[PDB]
Design a protein around this ligand. Structure first.
Ligand SMILES: N[C@H]1CCOc2ccc(F)cc21
Ligand SMILES: N[C@H]1CCOc2ccc(F)cc21
Lengths: 103, 102
């Protein structure tokens, strides 16, 4: 019943974001949300940003997602972040991995 | 809820193993296990090794893990392996990536 992500077609991009990522998986709906986050090693969440889903193109096994602009556009080394797909208030997918690179 | 791995502070190490890897995530418990694996491209698992967790230091969002020694310390090129966190008999995280170097 949870959203599931089997694959993503994009693992990185420049800090501005603003490019399409395709998620292959299961149990996506027009109410699925995609949420990018980042945590410190000790687990404090220091970033959260919802990503825009293209709901016309998306299908129950295929989500089209616009990668967010990263929290700090002035980073000087690549930064590892996560994203998950969530249905409702609690049914979230496993966390996926993504990397932003400096301009 | 399944174990979830959001971060690892170590992506690789030498075949000796023994250094500490911190995993950041969710739904870890004192019974969580960390299992390293290797499989061929036809998908046959050719290595399985449980990694020792420091259960005193670990928290529900942090696992302190001793990286295992790799199965063959005489390799001459790096080897890609996976690891996962498992609670109970079958509730596992998706596979994470790791590399052993010669
Ligand atoms: N285009 C609709 C119908 C097909 O199923 C989905 C799944 C996710 C989504 F965002 C939109 C849609
Ligand atoms: N130190 C205990 C209590 C806090 O939660 C955890 C989580 C994982 C673990 F290995 C041990 C513990």
């Amino acid at each position: 019943e949870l959203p599931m992500v089997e694959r993503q077609d994009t693992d990185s991009c420049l800090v501005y974001g603003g490019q399409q990522m395709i998620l292959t998986g299961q149990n996506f709906t027009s109410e699925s949300k995609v949420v990018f986050t980042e945590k410190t090693t000790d687990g404090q969440q220091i970033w959260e940003m919802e990503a825009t889903v293209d709901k016309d193109k998306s299908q129950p096994n295929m989500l089209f997602v616009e990668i967010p602009e990263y929290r700090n556009k002035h980073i000087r080394t690549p930064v590892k972040v996560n994203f998950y797909v969530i249905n409702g208030k609690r049914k979230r997918s496993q966390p996926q991995h993504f990397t932003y690179h400096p301009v």
